[PDB]
């Protein structure tokens, strides 16, 4: 009946500093489809954030992609905030240019 989401936070293109890019959050493998995903720059949510359409896998588990334009710097902290019904409290994954 219920599934807890997986989260990956990455960039569309190999991040170079100062060069514009796209920050991705791939929530997957969760059920039901009601989920909440926020893209954060220094703890504040990024204004223009968009998602995919709602699709699901063969095992019925939904997946969604959230993405936003972003310029990676060396002092800025980018992170993804997922809050689903299956979570004790909202989970926070940080972007890491090496992952």
């Amino acid at each position: 009946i219920q599934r807890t989401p997986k989260i990956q936070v990455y960039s569309r293109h190999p991040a170079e500093n100062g060069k514009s890019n796209f920050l991705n959050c791939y929530v997957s493998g969760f059920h039901p489809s009601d989920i909440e995903v926020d893209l954060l720059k220094n703890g504040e949510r990024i204004e223009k954030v968009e998602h995919s359409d709602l699709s699901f896998s063969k095992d019925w588990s939904f997946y969604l992609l959230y993405y936003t334009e972003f310029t990676p710097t060396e002092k800025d902290e980018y992170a993804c905030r997922v809050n689903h019904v299956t979570l004790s409290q909202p989970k926070i994954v940080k972007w890491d240019r090496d992952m």
Partner: protein, 277 residues
Amino acid sequence: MGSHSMRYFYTAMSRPGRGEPRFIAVGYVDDTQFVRFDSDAASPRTEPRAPWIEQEGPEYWDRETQISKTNTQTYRENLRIALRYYNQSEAGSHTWQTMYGCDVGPDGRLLRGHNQYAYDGKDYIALNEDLSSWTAADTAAQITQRKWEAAREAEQLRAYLEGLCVEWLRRHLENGKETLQRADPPKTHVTHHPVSDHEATLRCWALGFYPAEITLTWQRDGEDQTQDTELVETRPAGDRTFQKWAAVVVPSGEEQRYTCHVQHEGLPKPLTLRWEP
């Protein structure tokens, strides 16, 4: 090069207290989305998500929007019926999923048919391979199994699967030959990530490939480091392409003892790359 499939995925979900049920429909040809319907928008209509589909007149769009607009009406009943069938109140949020479609050979002929349902992530019913019988998952799906046997639905469906599904799939494949029947290899590389004074993380990248099918592995001195490799779920870049990395934790100096092995249908022969300092 011609094992291709058209796939529709439906998703209906109730929202008690706050809202009418939502219907969301997506359509794929292989790993390439080309449509999208959403009943929760400004006069819902189905919309193109690919380039070769915008060439279709408002004939397609109109027919395809109404199909969804009726499928919406259908899935609002399916939610209210499954309430009866499962002895459930108008209180909980429950969920229908459906996958129909057709695989097709390189000759363009039907190869496999699909139709299957799931209430709340549990399989509910699934048309079998023969496109003539069913597979109910519980006694409540059996109510539906005999409704549909007594109604020759497995006929109406086989028709669409053997007829319209396969014909339109060939249309789609043709109108977007370069976009659908093309496999672009990855852009692979190895990065180095010292996690200690002592040891380091060798990470192997696969970027911008299509389709999503890929096989990365780590090999130390020509052996399967299967239990000791970190693999991430193949992910979308946001641009028809996908990524995926494999990463392993090695000593220091022993780095050239490792190799990353990429297999992809866009590659002539499999890859073998190590860390180039």
